[PDB]
Design a protein around this ligand. Structure first.
Ligand code: HEM
Ligand SMILES: [Ca+2]
Ligand SMILES: [Ca+2]
Ligand SMILES: [O]
Length: 306
């Protein structure tokens, strides 16, 4: 079983080293906290939080970095290498990349103004990467609510609160125009925009993402507080201002009878949201971890030890 005190004897300063790395990076890249939280999410949804996503290509297995959900999207890998090297200096061969990324995700959330808590630790690193599994397990913005629920249940998160709270990760960070083009000009082959997108916001988004424009252009997930981790993401949904299809469906899907009350609850209280976010985050961080003597303590997060 994972425990928050796992490194209190072997590397008590690990959390501080991680925080310092992120604080420093945030000065030149204000998007890094959001990027790191997402890396942890994409790690945990593929064979569990085993740092499998950090592995680079080898002649025997392909990297998850080339998965449809990661390619030209996932970022911050060099920052993880930086904190890993710093931790290896402070405490040689002690902290696993999987745990390091979990702490990095929590510290990123806290630094962005979110809740502060000690994550369970003791995870170990995978001996391989899973590209096919990443392609099958990572959800997509065009997923219907039933599909989003299926995706979460598939990795072990049965609760709608898991889905609604964790989707709160979109309270900050960026999104490429490519992922909302259908919502803006031709949703579900209607030649019309997604009716669940507020018409005033629709005009704003069309200006940021014109037809035939730069699909890689970046837009903020949260129009209220783009870089602050707070419950504004849910207030947006209530006003039909969720950015991507998967965001708005939590409030507008015909299958949202169970998610709507959660959306409202989180929009109404920061405390209720933060509590639910920590609860869901720890549940996600508990997905099929390698523990004890299973796996290894990777020295270089990009490659398996040899
Ligand atoms: C529920 C299904 C989800 C879907 C379909 C989804 C989809 C997306 C998409 C399309 C992007 C934009 C990627 C790009 O433009 O390159 C993105 C970004 C992001 N997502 Fe998710 N996401 C989901 C869940 C989550 C969860 C569970 C978290 C974390 C708890 C999360 C955190 C983030 C963050 C912070 C960003 C911004 C990353 C950055 O700016 O570098 N997402 N997501
Ligand atoms: Ca993984
Ligand atoms: Ca926000
Ligand atoms: O994501």
């Amino acid at each position: 079983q994972l425990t928050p005190t796992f490194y209190d004897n072997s590397c008590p300063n690990v959390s501080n080293i991680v925080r310092d790395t992120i604080v420093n990076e945030l000065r030149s890249d204000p998007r890094i906290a959001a990027s790191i939280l997402r890396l942890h999410f994409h790690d945990c949804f593929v064979n569990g939080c085993d740092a499998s996503i950090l592995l680079d290509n080898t002649t025997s297995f392909r990297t998850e970095k080339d998965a449809f959900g990661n390619a030209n999207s996932a970022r911050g890998f060099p920052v993880i290498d930086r904190m890993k090297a710093a931790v290896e200096s402070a405490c040689p061969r002690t902290v696993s990349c999987a745990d390091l990324l979990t702490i990095a995700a929590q510290q990123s959330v806290t630094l962005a103004g979110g809740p502060s808590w000690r994550v369970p630790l003791g995870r170990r690193d995978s001996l391989q990467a899973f590209l096919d599994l990443a392609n099958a397990n990572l959800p997509a913005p065009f997923f219907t609510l039933p599909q989003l629920k299926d995706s979460f249940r598939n990795v072990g998160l049965n609760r709608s609160s898991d889905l609604v709270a964790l989707s709160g990760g979109h309270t900050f960070g960026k999104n490429q125009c490519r992922f909302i083009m259908d919502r803006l000009y031709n949703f579900s082959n209607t030649g019309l925009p997604d009716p669940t997108l507020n018409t005033t916001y629709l005009q704003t988004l069309r200006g940021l993402c014109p037809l035939n424009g730069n699909l890689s252009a970046l837009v903020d997930f949260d129009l209220r507080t783009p870089t602050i981790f707070d419950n504004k993401y849910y207030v947006n949904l209530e006003e039909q201002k969720g950015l991507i299809q998967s965001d708005q469906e939590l409030f507008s899907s015909p299958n949202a009878t169970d998610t709507i009350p959660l959306v409202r609850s989180f929009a109404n209280s920061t405390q209720t949201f933060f509590n639910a976010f920590v609860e869901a985050m720890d549940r996600m961080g508990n997905i099929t971890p390698l523990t004890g003597t299973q796996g290894q303590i990777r020295l270089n997060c990009r490659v398996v030890n040899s």
